[PDB]
Amino acid sequence: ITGTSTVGVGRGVLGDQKNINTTYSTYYYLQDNTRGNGIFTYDAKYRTTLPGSLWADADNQFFASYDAPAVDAHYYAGVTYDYYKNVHNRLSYDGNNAAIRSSVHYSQGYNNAFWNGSQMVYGDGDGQTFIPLSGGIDVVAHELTHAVTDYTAGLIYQNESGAINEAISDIFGTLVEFYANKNPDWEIGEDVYTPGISGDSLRSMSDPAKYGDPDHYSKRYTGTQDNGGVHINSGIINKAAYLISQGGTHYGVSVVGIGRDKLGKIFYRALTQYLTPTSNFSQLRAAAVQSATDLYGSTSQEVASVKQAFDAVGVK
Numbered sequence: 001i002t003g004t005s006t007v008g009v010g011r012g013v014l015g016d017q018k019n020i021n022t023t024y025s026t027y028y029y030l031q032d033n034t035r036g037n038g039i040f041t042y043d044a045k046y047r048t049t050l051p052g053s054l055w056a057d058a059d060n061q062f063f064a065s066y067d068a069p070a071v072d073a074h075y076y077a078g079v080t081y082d083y084y085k086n087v088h089n090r091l092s093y094d095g096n097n098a099a100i101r102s103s104v105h106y107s108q109g110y111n112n113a114f115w116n117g118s119q120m121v122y123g124d125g126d127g128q129t130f131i132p133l134s135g136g137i138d139v140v141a142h143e144l145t146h147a148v149t150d151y152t153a154g155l156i157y158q159n160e161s162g163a164i165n166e167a168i169s170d171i172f173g174t175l176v177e178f179y180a181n182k183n184p185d186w187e188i189g190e191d192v193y194t195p196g197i198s199g200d201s202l203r204s205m206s207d208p209a210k211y212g213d214p215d216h217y218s219k220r221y222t223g224t225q226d227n228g229g230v231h232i233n234s235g236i237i238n239k240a241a242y243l244i245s246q247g248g249t250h251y252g253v254s255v256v257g258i259g260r261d262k263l264g265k266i267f268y269r270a271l272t273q274y275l276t277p278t279s280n281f282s283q284l285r286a287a288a289v290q291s292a293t294d295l296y297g298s299t300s301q302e303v304a305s306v307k308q309a310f311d312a313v314g315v316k
């Protein structure tokens with residue numbers, strides 16, 4: 001890890017050419033010394049033991065298919081770091097510039113990715129349902145945002161708190177996708193999901209019910225699956241967030257869109273200054289309204305739009 005900072009070149013999961021920050025001692029390692037205490041990408045070698053080996057390359061050129069997921073994990077972790085620093089003035093996930101670690105090639109045909117409490121972990125997918133998940137930018141940002149949440153609001157992963165947690169992750173994932181301006185959309189996971197099927201995705205913020213998730217509180221999942229539906233009920237918060245930014249009419253309730261940036265500022269403020277581990281949807285509403293009030297003033301259009309948006313999804 002002690003070495004000379006330099007720049008390598010490679011190809012990502014989708015075949016796009018990419019420059020990446022690397023470190024050289026006797027080998028070129030994926031270690032980025034330009035951001036905080038650094039970004040480290042590891043090879044899990046198809047096994048489940050973590051983190052694995054710090055990625056080492058001989059020529060500082062990663063064009064091998066085996067290389068592709070490491071390139072994107074390393075790179076997109078950088079973009080996400082840049083996002084929080086430049087937009088939100090936050091240094092890494094803990095605010096202290098903690099090192100960011102990612103392991104790729106996790107297990108075999110593993111169709112998920114996650115934050116394990118320490119590092120990010122990415123599967124390669126089975127090549128049918130998924131391709132390597134580090135290929136999506138919103139996925140990377142989604143997982144990385146879990147750390148941010150873990151270090152600030154500490155939303156428990158279960159029931160409504162959990163749903164909020166997931167929603168935050170999707171929201172900021174999407175915002176990062178827009179920030180990097182790489183084929184941005186309000187869909188989640190569209191780049192790495194189901195190769196061979198065009199136009200679909202894992203979740204939709206604009207229209208969750210497309211994939212069977214609730215767009216309204218009365219439609220919320222009350223069962224015990226998925227930790228009480230953290231990946232399901234998130235649709236309700238996701239829809240509200242979409243409406244705040246883009247505006248629209250939902251179940252007869254109209255919302256004036258205030259844009260992405262203000263959405264981001266409002267929700268980041270709610271996340272950092274207000275939400276607690278046990279916060280529910282109502283409390284989230286309160287937090288967001290208070291945040292918007294803090295930033296733009298109580299009589300502002302912004303507050304009004306937050307209100308309208310949460311009214312639309314039936315969260316009072």
Ligand SMILES: [Ca+2]
Pocket residue numbers: 057058059060061062063
């Ligand atoms: Ca090489």
Ligand SMILES: [Ca+2]
Pocket residue numbers: 177182183184185190191
């Ligand atoms: Ca996209």
Ligand SMILES: [Ca+2]
Pocket residue numbers: 138174177184185186187188189190
């Ligand atoms: Ca997306």
Ligand SMILES: [Ca+2]
Pocket residue numbers: 190193194195196197198199200201
């Ligand atoms: Ca697809």
Ligand SMILES: [Zn+2]
Pocket residue numbers: 142143146166169
């Ligand atoms: Zn998540």
